[PDB]
Structure 1
Amino acid sequence: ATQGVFTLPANTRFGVTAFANSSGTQTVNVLVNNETAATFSGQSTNNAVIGTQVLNSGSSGKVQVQVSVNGRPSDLVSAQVILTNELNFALVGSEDGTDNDYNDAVVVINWPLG
């Protein structure tokens, strides 16, 4: 199934933050309406917060997270969870190798802000 794709409410600010847990350098791209809106990278085996940014979901509300290592797409897992019918988290994990820890880059999207 497709993973790392989320429909947000239109014209809404959201946070996106990425964490690294890998010997390989992670690159995280965040697309809004199919155009890159943020890119983060780093290399940590201790959960470094390699990047954070505030974005707007725009007219479409379509947000996509992609992760690559050495130019090769990682395998993604994702879900969205909503608490008290108000607080939203879109969650992504990724695997760059064979150990299947799926933490090599972790991406958290949250809304609303403010």
Structure 2
Amino acid sequence: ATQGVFTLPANTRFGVTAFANSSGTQTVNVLVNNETAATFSGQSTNNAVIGTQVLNSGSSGKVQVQVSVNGRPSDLVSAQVILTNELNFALVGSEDGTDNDYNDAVVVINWPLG
């Protein structure tokens, strides 16, 4: 199934934050309505916050996360969770190798903000 794609509330600010846990340099791309809106990169095996940004979900609300290492797309796993019918997290894990820890880049999207 498709992973890393989320329908957010339209026209709404959200946070997107990426963590790295791999020997490989991660590159995380965040697309809003199919166009790159943010790119984060770094290399850490200790959960460094390689990027954090506030974006607007735009007219369609479509947000997609893509991860690559040295130009190779990582395999993604994702889900969205909603607490108290209001607080949202869209969660992404990714695997760049063979150990299947799925933490090589971890991406958390949160809304609402403010």
Q: TM-score interval w.r.t. the shorter chain?
A: over 0.9
Counterpart-to-counterpart distance in 1, 2:68 and 2:35: 16
SS, match of residue 24 in structure 1: coil
Please tell me whether residue 11 in structure 1 is matched to residue 39 in structure 2: no
Counterpart-to-counterpart distance in 2, 1:11 and 1:41: 26
Q: With structure 2 as the length reference, what TM-score do the two structures score?
A: 1.00
Counterpart-to-counterpart distance in 1, 2:68 and 2:15: 20
Q: 1:51-70 CA deviation, whole Å, 9 max, x = no partner?
A: 00000000000000000000
Please tell me whether residue 74 in structure 1 is matched to residue 74 in structure 2: yes
Counterpart-to-counterpart distance in 1, 2:82 and 2:28: 23
SS, match of residue 49 in structure 1: strand
Q: 1:23-42 CA deviation, whole Å, 9 max, x = no partner?
A: 00000000000000000000
Q: CA RMSD in A?
A: 0.2
Match of 1:83 in 2: 83
Counterpart-to-counterpart distance in 2, 1:60 and 1:33: 6
Cα drift, residue 83 of structure 1? 0.1
Counterpart-to-counterpart distance in 2, 1:37 and 1:85: 28
Match of 1:52 in 2: 52
- Which structure 1 residue ranges, 5 or more long, are not aligned? none
Cα drift, residue 89 of structure 1? 0.0
Tell me which stretches of 4 or more aligned residues in structure 1 moved more than 3 Å: none
Please tell me whether residue 23 in structure 1 is matched to residue 23 in structure 2: yes
Q: 1:69-96 CA deviation, whole Å, 9 max, x = no partner?
A: 0000000000000000000000000000
SS, match of residue 39 in structure 1: strand
Q: With structure 1 as the length reference, what TM-score do the two structures score?
A: 1.00
- Which structure 2 residue ranges, 5 or more long, are not aligned? none
Counterpart-to-counterpart distance in 1, 2:26 and 2:57: 24
Counterpart-to-counterpart distance in 1, 2:64 and 2:71: 17
